[PDB]
Amino acid sequence: RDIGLRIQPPAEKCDDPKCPWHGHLKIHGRVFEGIVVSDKPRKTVTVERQYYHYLKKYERYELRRSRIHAHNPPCINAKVGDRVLIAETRPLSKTKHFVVVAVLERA
Amino acid sequence: ATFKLVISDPKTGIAKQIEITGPEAEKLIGKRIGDQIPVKELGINLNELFGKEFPEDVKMEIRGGTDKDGFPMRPDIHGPRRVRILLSKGPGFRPKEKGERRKKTVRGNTISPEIVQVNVKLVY
Amino acid sequence: ARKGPKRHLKRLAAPTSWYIERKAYKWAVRPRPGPHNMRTSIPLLYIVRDYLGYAKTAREARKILNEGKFLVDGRVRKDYKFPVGIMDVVSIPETGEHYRVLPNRIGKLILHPISEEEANIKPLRIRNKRMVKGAKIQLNFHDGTNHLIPLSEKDNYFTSYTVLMKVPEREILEVLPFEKGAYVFVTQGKNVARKGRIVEIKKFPMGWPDVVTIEDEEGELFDTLKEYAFVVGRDKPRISLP
């Protein structure tokens, strides 16, 4: 099956209606790549991405990081420390607006 | 208690106004809106008022009234007390705008000495 | 707009595709909802008064319109707020003149004189296509109008094709496919008003719009969005273009 990302689907199936691969969830908007830094809650992960910001006055850079909470389908089940790909969806909770679609490199 | 009575003839659309006081007016105190009472018992030369012959035992029913201060009576409020309520239509309020509601002062059902005007109609 | 829709429009905030003096007065005509969108249309009053110059004041412009002196796509228009847009035909039969509305080289709307015979046809870009009750196909064009076709011809029409419609009868007489070698005219963007032939088409994942490459008469190649390319012929234009 394809959902517009041109990547491999997960090996097994699930019954979660919030799964973009096997359920009714739809993805549309930005797609990011990051590192998981927390997986304590059920079906929830925190993903961190790093980038550089340029300071015009001092003509130098500084390091900044962005943290995003994402839904974790059972068919994927990412853990702490591995690279993941996330996509934007409709609001799912107070703070969750993304879903994990692929694990790129297991820890 | 002095009552100013407005008697309406439904069969012609003509109304007459007379003033009633004394023991006769004391009889009328206590009645609500929507009850009949023979005119002969009250005591009135009805045929002289309208200049027309009338059938015997004709009676009238109380339709409305206004107190000495100018506030009207509302059929759906029990008792003789005076209240101030929020209204959207009906007697005692003329809307003038779609959906408008306003707070107005009104009287009740029962007749009391404060009432001055009493509107009644003949029932043949 | 604290509590409801806006009804006014300042001169300084007018759309940038009009030919208008932005500091002469305070207000401008807010266009009525209609065929095209805001960015590709202009109210009829400005055509009557400022472009052609048949009237000096707005009051005498309205008197002309109410007498039915102006035809847009072969239909009498009396509303001075009516929007007139790309590929429309403006006809004055009493003077016997006809114009087509086209974007400029810098993105402004201009009137291009055309012949009387060409004034009877209008090109429409197929913007969308759907199924409708009774199992029929409805075509939605770029100017908001609609058409119905039977289930038998469902394979003769696709999005981005162009249909040459005879107005005001609204009768189809030609279909121009979108493919390599077709002749196109650009309507928006940096390369607006350039024309040429299609060379290549590219696509992208996750809903990004697709891009086309066009070769002009001099042999130069340039890219633009697919939805900004308007098909006007097989290998030569079917209508007069500036």
Add this chain to the structure above:
Amino acid sequence: MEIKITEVKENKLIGRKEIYFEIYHPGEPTPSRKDVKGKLVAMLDLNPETTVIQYIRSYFGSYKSKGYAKYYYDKDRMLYIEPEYILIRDGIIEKK
């Protein structure tokens, strides 16, 4: 004064013709409306009753003035199209 016609344009939709002109007059005051109207109707064979002078304008250090006028083929059309004030100012009708 010398009157020179710059442009004459036909307007079938309204039913009138529009006339632009210049007046050369060194050492003289700005011409009056009556004189200009008489000169124009003499020059182009126009009925004076359906001719209106929109404006006569003078400039800072010029010896000439610019004028704009209109001519209608029907009196009723002129009454229906033109504003009331311009007809009073040109003496065509009488103010109340």
Add this chain to the structure above:
RNA sequence: ACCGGCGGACGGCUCAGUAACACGUCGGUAACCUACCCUCGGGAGGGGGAUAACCCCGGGAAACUGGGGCUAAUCCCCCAUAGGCCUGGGGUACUGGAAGGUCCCCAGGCCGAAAGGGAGCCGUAAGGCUCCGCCCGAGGAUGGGCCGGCGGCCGAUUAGGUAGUUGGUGGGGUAACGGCCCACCAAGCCGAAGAUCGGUACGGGCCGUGAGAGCGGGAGCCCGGAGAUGGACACUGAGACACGGGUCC
């Protein structure tokens, strides 16, 4: 003059509040509403009712307001048909990057339209012929709602903060997604890369100064936000919890 229709939610004024998805910018809505306007496809069958204006009598210091009689509509109410919505079982015709979407066939229910009205000519009359109109469906347009990533003040003589708090499961409510609100199960969420708290401020396009790098301001014109003596809360409508509309303290 009155009944009736549309408008009065725009325009105009000010910067108190607000350190926040308020504002700037790029994207999303396959999670939503929209009277007036444009195109295409259809419809307008049968009944019923009151009341203002007007006449008789009035009440009240006034603001206001009562009873009886009589009448019309593009006013109001019914019946039918069309149509709309929910759920279960099949078929695969459309758009799209991708169907809880659209289309076709059965089945159980609930909701449920309309004004052939007005004007002018030819009509002896019959009836046409134009002009303005009424209702339903599909799409657009216009005006908005909601969501995300990134960007822009000062204080450590403010170091720990949070307990519907963070997430899950099952529902309710909304035009619509959502701890928005409930019932139950877990212990999460933020923080020395400055949380929490305190101070001061409407944001931007821009404006003043300087060779430039910078430093300072953001009343007047445009775009966005908020308010109508302070604090709460509703009716009508497509749109308001409404500056020249309503209720309480």
